[PDB]
Amino acid sequence: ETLNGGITDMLTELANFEKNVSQAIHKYNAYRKAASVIAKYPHKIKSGAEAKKLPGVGTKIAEKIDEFLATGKLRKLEKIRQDDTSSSINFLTRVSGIGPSAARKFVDEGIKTLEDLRKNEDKLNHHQRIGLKYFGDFEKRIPREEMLQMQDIVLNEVKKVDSEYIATVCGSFRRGAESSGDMDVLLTHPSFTSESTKQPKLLHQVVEQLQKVHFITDTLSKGETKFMGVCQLPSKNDEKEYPHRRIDIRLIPKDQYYCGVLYFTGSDIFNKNMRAHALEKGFTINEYTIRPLGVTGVAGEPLPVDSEKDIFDYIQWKYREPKDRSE
DNA sequence: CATCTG
DNA sequence: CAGATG
Ligand SMILES: [Mn+2]
Ligand code: NA
Ligand code: NA
């Protein structure tokens, strides 16, 4: 956790570069398991050879470790941080909608900066365009003091649309969190579940209301169950407007709300543990259900859930406030 | 995983 | 449809 930090760090830099700049998925993946296992390792790696002893640890990585340990740097690592092409790709990628793949093509055509992109706004698709337009807004975190206003917003509209809606703002917001990065709304309705063959309106009618009132500003992606978009809190009495915030709405069959709700509420760490325990208690949990584990090796059969309560219970645990859902 | 693109 | 993004 700090005993082999630098090693796991340079390791991740190296790994990440493989995938992003080069295409070395294998290589990339290599650096990863490596950084993974050295992270667990209980000692203070004093040498290459020592590391090597580890699985996932080959001759090449060991080489790297050695040089790093020996000299506070790494040449390859140094050379990579200089390289324009590499830095360019790391940057482009910052734009929502731009992935490494596209990051390469742009750079190859010479688009390396923001200006570059504006100049060639023609080459970008919608998401990408939006991504570019709200570059800055996009990177700003979200003060919960804002979140509450928004949550307040969304909730009132869904309500006015159909009283049977059930909306939940999951995320860190849900877990206390002073600020968040984006707004996750989980949605369900009684009229929608496992078997119930579809109902798009379900999602589209609200999306619509939200835009209606001008909360939703753009659309990144709009499928029949998940909607990716842009939104913003009405600027009061013009002098101080709000940054555009990224939002995500998503349909959930009533019979699988709380699992996802639970789930999405994170944090990863809270999840797994809850997950590992579910296991002991003779169960299973994933993003939509909690099944009773048979013994034959495994089994199934979606247990019925009416609240986040029903799930803890199940695993015979202490119902945890969302706030404390920490780790 | 679900959606967009081309 | 394969392949990209989030
Ligand atoms: Mn979020
Ligand atoms: Na991006
Ligand atoms: Na292939």
> Residue A193 to residues A102, A206, A237, A288, A309: CA-CA distances in angstroms?
38, 18, 43, 11, 20
- For residues A45 and A27, give the distance between their C-alpha atoms in angstroms, rounded to a whole number: 22
Backbone phi, psi, residue A168, to 5°: -140, 130
Q: State the residue for tokens 């700049």.
A: A21
SS3 A180: strand
CA atom of A114 to C1′ atom of B5, Å: 23
Report which of residues 224-253 in chain A place their beta carbon less than 7 angstroms from any atom of strand B: 224-226
Ligand 1 centre to CA of A261 (Å) is: 13
Identical fold between A1-83 and A264-326: no
* Amino acid identity for residue A152 in this structure: D
Could you tell me which of A268, A315, A261 has the C-alpha nearest to residue A287? A261
First to last CA, chain A: 16
Residues in CB range of A291: below 8 A, 6 or more apart: A283, A284, A285, A299, A300, A301, A302, A303
The answer to whether residue A64 is catalytic is: yes
Ligand 2 centroid – CA A92 distance (Å)? 7
Structural determination approach? X-ray
Q: What is the 3-state secondary structure (H, E, C) of A198-221?
A: CCCHHHHHHHHHHHHCCCEEEEEE
Provide the CB-side half-sphere exposure for A210 (13 A, CA).
Answer: 28
Question: Can you tell me whether residue A292 is helix, strand or coil?
Answer: strand
What would the CATH number be for the domain defined by A141-263?
A: 3.30.460.10
Q: Which residue is nearest to nucleotide C3 (CA to C1')?
A: A101
Q: Which nucleotide across the nucleic acid strands is nearest to A251, CA versus C1'?
A: B2
Q: What would the DSSP string read from start to end of A214-262?
A: T-EEEEEEE-SSEEEEEE----SSSS-PPPPEEEEEEEEEGGGHHHHHH
- State the pairing for strand pair A283-285/A290-292: antiparallel
Q: In what order do the strands lie in the sheet with A183-189?
A: A166-169, A183-189, A245-253, A226-231, A216-222
Instruction: Give the distance (Å) from ligand 2 centre to CA of residue A163.
Output: 37
Residues (107-166, chain A) with CB within 7 Å of strand C atoms: 127, 131
Instruction: Map out the domains of chain A as residue ranges.
Output: 1-83, 84-140, 141-263, 264-326
Homologous superfamily (CATH) of A1-83 is DNA polymerase beta, N-terminal domain-like (1.10.150.110)
Q: How far does residue A271's CA lie from ligand 1's centre (Å)? A: 16
What pairs with residue A216 in β-bridges?
Answer: A231
8 A C-beta contact, residue A68 and residue A51:
no
3-state secondary structure of A263: helix
CATH topology of domain A264-326: Beta Polymerase; domain 3 (3.30.210)
The CATH number of A84-140 is 1.10.150.20
Burial string for A211-246 (b: 16+ CB within 10 Å, else e) reads eeeebbbbebeeeebebbbbbbbeeeeeeeebebbb
> Ligand nearest A245 Cα, by number?
1
Q: Using CB atoms within 10 A of its CB, is residue A70 exposed (0-12), middle (13-18) or buried (19+)?
A: exposed
Token pair belonging to A113: 């900066």
> What is the experimental resolution, given in Å to one decimal place?
2.9
Instruction: Report residue A212 as tokens.
Output: 């209606």
- Two tokens, residue A101: 């793949």
Amino acid at A76: K
Question: Which H helix or E strand runs over A189?
Answer: strand A183-189
Which residues make up the environment of ion ligand 1, defined by Cβ < 5 Å?
A 171, 182, 184
Q: CA-to-C1' distance for A125 and B3, Å?
A: 14
Q: Which of A40, A44, A64, A236 is catalytic?
A: A64
